[PDB]
């Protein structure tokens, strides 16, 4: 960072959204060595995941539940006949409806992560117009001179200013005779547009916190489709397993 | 995704309002392996479903639900005189009023998923035009100088200013002796329209709710069409396979 | 400080945020020869922290927590295998999860002095334009004139005025025969900014503070997250070390 004219702009966006994103729910009973955030952050990113029994000796679990890639086959519903578990440096060949549980985020497992993605894009687009345009309000005119011309408003401005003068020589008017004054300024203002792009920002926070269900109508009901699906994977997890797995919308992050 | 001047807009929208389309109502006593979501999904997406009993053995289903398609033939009134069911990799021949139910969205069999291909397209229309008319906010104005003024003006930005500004070498300007500048504005400024674009969005969001009968007597008119429509084939299904089905509206995903 | 048209502005809002940032919790019963101040400064500086049983008998601590850098190995889920502490002058290699406690300001483990360095940098900005602008307001018209025409009018002023004329000798003017005035006005005017600047400046303020969760739900919202890790770390020390630390949120500085 702290380089002219830029800035790392996204991270600042996408990990503080994140970090909202991964707080909606909070899974309570789990599988020894195995954490609420390991199943969301699977939901979170992928949309879809799969929690199955580990049979690999050399990985230190008894059950996993990992980002779920189908297989390309399917039922006359278009549902995928097998599922594969996704792992850091490792990977599940096909594991299946009568072996393992496919959970979703929603119906469709769009992930929560593509909508965070696009709105970040679009908030530093808007940082960098905020910065753009506040630069540009320094400099409503600009004076073309001569050389001896030039010298002589640095003496004005030396007087009573604080600052040097927006003066520069223009060669076409230093050379040509006859007619041209010697002095002519060109008007660069810009709009003022500062207390306007604070107000778009915020009304692209409001509908990125819509998507996510977080904030009433709608975002209420996105909260309810994504908590049911939720319930409706944790009753097949306790009865293929018997592992009495309960899931909770998060009201509050301490319970007391 | 993340390529420059594009995004993969229309999922985000076209996943997103499908979710809330496809839990408008509830079935909740079913045949051995079918699904709530199995006949609605063929009412989302065709406007149209057969209900009938499977007769192929390869296929490990004692009743199907399928999207239908009727065959040209007619009565005195228009009604079609046999249905085909069908299915992924499958294609079942001419089913009939006889021993199978076909269902409908509404009387038109008007699917409801035409609405949301519309407005997925106009709203990934109005996403390309902010970004665009953001971008444009950059460039109020742009200069066209000779080279040498070029090089005199970054001198004078560099004292103060924390960009490059928005000057270029005119070729014409250059070349040309006798009169003309040295120095060119040319007035580039847009009209802001961001405001104006995230309330037209909106005003699109919910003409897409209303036609869906989610969202108030229109809407609420709209819902309970499509709720006689369903309760009318759910008394049919029972009288001729004696299968107690029952469809409810969901006024909440949870029960309890 | 105290330079023409410059002020040492970045340690101002700097250090007066920090202060601000540093100041949102304290943890209350601590080992011997340590201070609530040096875990919330690893947690703010770095976003991660180390806490751990001291070896190297040079040091005069029995726990130490430090800024933390994970090594680039990971489990299945991509939690690091390994920690190294930072310390002032010093490096502790490979502390694990068997020996020692990772503590996070949030779950990505983004710093909160991000937030603040570009908070910083876009409040020095605004200053240095609202210090342009108004030294812009003693200029709104400029003459140029002969060198007898500037002395007469300088009499004309020394008459009622209490300052000097913004007169200069325009070089062209005084040269050239035939048509041209003898006097010419170029207007300066800029417009009017520093109400609109002090502002923004406020609206910039209540940003930064919203990300710091200092400042209502997305507020609340932000603290009760860090809060939760700081928790959840905290009973993970009291069991590998048996040591009673408790943290509370800062609601007053003083207790009575």
Same mark, same amino acid.
């Given at each position: 960072i702290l380089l002219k004219n830029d800035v790392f702009m996204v991270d600042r966006y996408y990990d503080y959204y994140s970090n909202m994103g991964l707080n909606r729910f909070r899974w309570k009973n789990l599988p020894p @060595?195995? %954490?609420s955030r390991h199943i969301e952050q699977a939901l979170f990113n992928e949309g879809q995941a799969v929690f199955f029994k580990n049979?690999? $000796?050399? %990985? $230190?679990?008894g059950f996993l539940c990992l980002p779920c890639a189908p297989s390309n086959g399917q039922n006359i519903y278009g549902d995928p006949v097998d599922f594969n578990g996704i792992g850091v440096n490792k990977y599940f060949t096909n594991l299946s409806p009568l072996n393992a549980v496919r959970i979703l985020d929603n119906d469709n497992g769009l992930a929560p992560v593509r909508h965070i993605a696009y709105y970040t894009y679009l908030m530093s687009q808007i940082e960098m117009t905020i910065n753009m345009n506040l630069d540009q309000q320094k400099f409503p005119i600009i004076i073309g001179a001569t050389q001896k011309n030039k010298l002589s408003m640095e003496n004005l401005y030396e007087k009573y200013s604080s600052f040097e003068p927006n003066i520069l020589v223009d060669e076409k008017l230093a050379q040509?005779?006859?007619? @041209?004054? @010697?002095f002519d300024a060109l008007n660069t203002q810009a709009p003022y547009l500062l207390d306007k792009l604070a107000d778009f920002k915020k009304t692209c926070e409001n509908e990125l916190l819509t998507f996510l269900g977080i904030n009433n109508s709608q975002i209420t009901f996105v909260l309810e489709m994504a908590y049911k699906n939720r319930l409706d994977a944790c009753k097949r997890i306790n009865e293929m397993f018997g592992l009495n797995l309960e899931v909770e919308k998060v009201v509050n992050l301490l319970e007391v």
């Open positions: @060595g195995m %954490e049979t690999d $000796p050399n %990985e $230190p679990y040509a005779l006859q007619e @041209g004054k @010697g």
